Amino acid sequence: PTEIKFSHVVAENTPKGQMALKFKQLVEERLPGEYQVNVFPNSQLFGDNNELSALLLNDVQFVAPSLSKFERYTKKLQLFDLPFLFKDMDAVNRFQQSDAGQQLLNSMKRKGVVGLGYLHNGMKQFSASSPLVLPEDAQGKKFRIMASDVLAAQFQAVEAIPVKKPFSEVFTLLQTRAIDGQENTWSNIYSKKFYEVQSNITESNHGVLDYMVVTSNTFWKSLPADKRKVIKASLDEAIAYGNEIAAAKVNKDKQAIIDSKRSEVTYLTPEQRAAWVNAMKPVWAQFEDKIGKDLIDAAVASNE
């Protein structure tokens, strides 16, 4: 059988982890003995910094990075890092499924990267070893971020110190107190046990963590059309599965964290939320020329 490799950086019991495993199941059911899919979770094969290079080198055939991690290939996907751009996951999905959103799947083709679909995780929440109620509380704290200039600007706007690090290192950096805080979805905070060493989480919903499932032109073109159709259908169905898992994990993992008693969740008043928005919104003007103001206008419009 022709081997297909799918590599990602998350734990198995997560929306992306389950997506990849479902994709394996469906492909192997439909094309038995023709294609086998080997899934490599937890950065076992490639991690944040080298996965896209590996993809284009055809050392791996599918990856699904955070939309934050594509700056080397397009400046447009930085849109998804803008603070308080999307109110909630309904707006995210409306944007992603619109013409404007769908066009972004093709934003990197001229560089060899084929966009196959969006996959959800969830809204991001701040955590630290001290309460984060107003933006002033972030002053002087070190936060790990995904490798994104927008996210660096986000934390610089509140006089915090952002450090770009691969996802596989975050637990250890929190454990050793090399950083004070981070931002992530409930699913990652829970599945990677960040909550065990973060006494405070704020339900800030201040950005989105979603993915684009991608492959290389090299691999995609190499498939016979009829097999590609089956593989694409299998991928799409796996994505829908992953999205259902993503939605479920928001509530389930938030609850599990609260039940553990290891972390105290803070909820923001409208005026507290407004203070974060006002502190961080200026980041957008920094990036708007490269992202595209019209693209930003489309994203804002998805909130209606």
Residue 188 labeled ligand binder: yes
Please say which residue, 115 or 135, places its beta carbon nearer to Cl ion. Answer: 115
Kindly state whether residue 18 participates in binding Cl ion, applying the rule CB under 5 A: no
Choose which of 7, 43, 78, 263 interacts with Cl ion (CB under 5 A): 43
Q: Which residue is nearest to Cl ion (CB)?
A: 47
Site for Cl ion in 69-128 (CB under 5 A): 117-118
Token pair of 102 as six digits: 């769908």
Q: How far is the CB of 273 from Cl ion (least distance, A)?
A: 27
Q: How far is the CB of 61 from Cl ion (least distance, A)?
A: 18
Q: How far is the CB of 148 from Cl ion (least distance, A)?
A: 14
Kindly state whether residue 186 participates in binding Cl ion, applying the rule CB under 5 A: no
Distance CA 18, CA 238 (A): 8
Residue 118 labeled ligand binder: no
Stretch that binds Cl ion, among 165-173, 174-182, 221-229, 272-280 (CB under 5 A): 165-173
Kindly state whether residue 50 participates in binding Cl ion, applying the rule CB under 5 A: no
Choose which of 47, 142, 227, 228 interacts with Cl ion (CB under 5 A): 47
Distance CA 17, CA 241 (A): 11
The count of residues interacting with Cl ion (CB under 5 A) is 15
Q: How far is the CB of 48 from Cl ion (least distance, A)?
A: 4
Kindly state whether residue 253 participates in binding Cl ion, applying the rule CB under 5 A: no
Residue 211 labeled ligand binder: yes
* φ, ψ at 29 (rounded to 5°): -70, -40
Closest CA to 283 of 80, 141, 76, 82: 82
Choose which of 6, 7, 9, 231 interacts with Cl ion (CB under 5 A): 9
Bridge partners for 35 per DSSP: 2
Kindly state whether residue 167 participates in binding Cl ion, applying the rule CB under 5 A: yes
Q: How far is the CB of 42 from Cl ion (least distance, A)?
A: 8
Kindly state whether residue 137 participates in binding Cl ion, applying the rule CB under 5 A: no
Q: How far is the CB of 219 from Cl ion (least distance, A)?
A: 19
* φ, ψ at 114 (rounded to 5°): -95, 120
Cα atoms in the Cβ-side hemisphere of radius 13 Å centred on 177? 3
Residue 16 labeled ligand binder: yes
Kindly state whether residue 211 participates in binding Cl ion, applying the rule CB under 5 A: no
Q: How far is the CB of 97 from Cl ion (least distance, A)?
A: 7
Please say which residue, 9 or 108, places its beta carbon nearer to Cl ion. Answer: 9
Kindly state whether residue 10 participates in binding Cl ion, applying the rule CB under 5 A: yes
Please say which residue, 35 or 190, places its beta carbon nearer to Cl ion. Answer: 190
Binding site residue list: 16, 69, 144, 184, 188, 211
Binding site for Cl ion (CB under 5 A): 9-11, 14, 43, 47-48, 117-118, 166-168, 188, 191-192
